[PDB]
Write a protein that binds this ligand. Structure first.
Ligand SMILES: *[C@](O)(C(N)=O)[C@H](C[C@@H]1CCNC1=O)NC(=O)[C@@H]1[C@@H]2[C@H](CN1C(=O)[C@@H](NC(=O)NC(C)(C)C)C(C)(C)C)C2(C)C
Length: 180
């Protein structure tokens, strides 16, 4: 209830639809002109953001201290408008909740909200054959079209949807220290 209300407002204010050469994704703006995509969006020097051409000033593919994959790409966007600063809503470590909402904003799943239930700290996963850490797990059969999906609870942005195995979905944890 409060989680759906939080998610609708979060997506209204900070989400957009992005097309890269590698497909269509939900993109979350974090602060200033920094957004996050799943790494496998592989954003070029230019992106479509809500059907408009936008330049990518910088692109950091995130890895932990061992160089392990986190499956997140931070993007600096060449635009005048700035994102509402949502770093306050990002945890310092992986959040587990009994009740989460996954919010999608593409052409395929426009403004849809999925109650995914319990989110558990999964940690390690071989994702696309790349070892990956900091994975949050929910028992939902996620499909193509949901990557970049934003995983939320009341007052919390928990992570970005990056993968599934047909029965479970996995989000990369969106941790505060990524955006210092
Ligand atoms: C996402 O890009 C999208 N278009 O929505 C997509 C979401 C997937 C597709 C089917 N279910 C989902 O939630 N993500 C991917 O395709 C990522 C991408 C490539 C592989 N990948 C996967 O999620 C794969 N899973 C996987 O590696 N399976 C394990 C090994 C964990 C058993 C797969 C096989 C495409 C579903 C990369 C770069 C991680």
């Amino acid at each position: 209830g409060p989680a759906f209300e939080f998610a609708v407002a979060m997506m209204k204010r900070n989400s957009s639809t992005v097309k890269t050469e590698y497909g269509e994704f939900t993109m979350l703006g974090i602060y200033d002109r920094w957004a996050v995509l799943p790494r496998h969006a592989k954003p070029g020097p230019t992106i479509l953001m809500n059907d408009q051409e936008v330049g990518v000033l910088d692109a950091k593919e995130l890895v932990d201290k061992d160089g392990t994959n986190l499956e997140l790409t931070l993007l600096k966007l060449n635009r005048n408008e700035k994102f509402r600063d949502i770093r306050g809503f990002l945890a310092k470590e992986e959040v587990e909740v009994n009740e989460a909402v996954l919010a999608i904003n593409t052409s395929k799943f426009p403004n849809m909200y999925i109650p995914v239930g319990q989110v558990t700290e999964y940690g390690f996963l071989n994702l696309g054959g790349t070892p990956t850490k900091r994975m949050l797990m929910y028992n939902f059969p996620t499909r193509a079209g949901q990557c970049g999906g934003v995983l939320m609870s009341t007052g919390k942005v928990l992570g970005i949807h990056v993968g599934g195995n047909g029965h479970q979905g996995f989000s990369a944890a969106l941790l505060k220290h990524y955006f210092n």
